[model samples]
Target: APIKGVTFGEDTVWEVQGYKNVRITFELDERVDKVLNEKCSVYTVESGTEVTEFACVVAEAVVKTLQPVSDLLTNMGIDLDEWSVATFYLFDDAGEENFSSRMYCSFYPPDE
Candidate 1:
């Protein structure tokens, strides 16, 4: 199977030991899985189609990069709500942020 798709679960919880305060859930899509399955190596392909085909191109890397942020934030004594909702928007000179209807961004349940 081609991995159904990568998505943060509904009301997902961060299980990291040091990061245990924020109710952080990712609002991402299927392209996330595809991009990750591709090892998240964008290869720096700049294109019009590339924009839609790889929405999570940055996400695959960001999700990993965010780990340190959570730890650093905690170390600085910052806390987020348990019922807090999370949102994501990958922007990096792709012209504009693309949110295709194909993206099942509902991966996170915004309601408590």
Candidate 2:
């Protein structure tokens, strides 16, 4: 299955919440079920060949990790339009930025 697209809320704020660091919520298109069978996770190898249960990786253990993930997806031949990947960066109570997490990514059919 492949996802449809990504959707952000009208007033989606990418900032800290009360007693929390930052929280953002986005919607997955209805077609997402058509793509992935499960939620997304950090893969084991650089090739993005294996999925891990870990929410945060070494690259994600930093304040910013979008570029790495983006690169990973791009290299994985992910179809940005057909599938929407949502990664969330979490922080500790001390405001120290931590790793980022994603729900899932999608790809196109072999014919496509």
State which candidate has the highest TM-score: 1
Query: What are the runs in model 2 whose C-alpha is more than 4 Å off?
Result: 1-27, 33-42, 45-97, 100-112
Tens digits of per-residue lDDT for model 1 on 1-112? Answer: 1111354443433321112111112343233334332443232322234433343443445456344345554555532221133343333323244433223223333234
Candidate 1 regions exceeding 4 Å error are: 1-43, 46-48, 69-112
lDDT (Cα, tens digit) per residue for candidate 2, span 27-84: 3234332222223322322212222222234214222322334455556664443222
TM-score of each: 0.25, 0.17
Global fold similarity of model 2 (TM-score): 0.17
The ten-residue window of minimal lDDT in model 2 covers: 16-25
What is the lDDT, from 0 to 100, of the residue 66 in candidate 1? Answer: 40
What is the RMSD, in Å, between candidate 2 and the native fold over all Cα? 17.8
Candidate 2 colliding pairs, count? 5
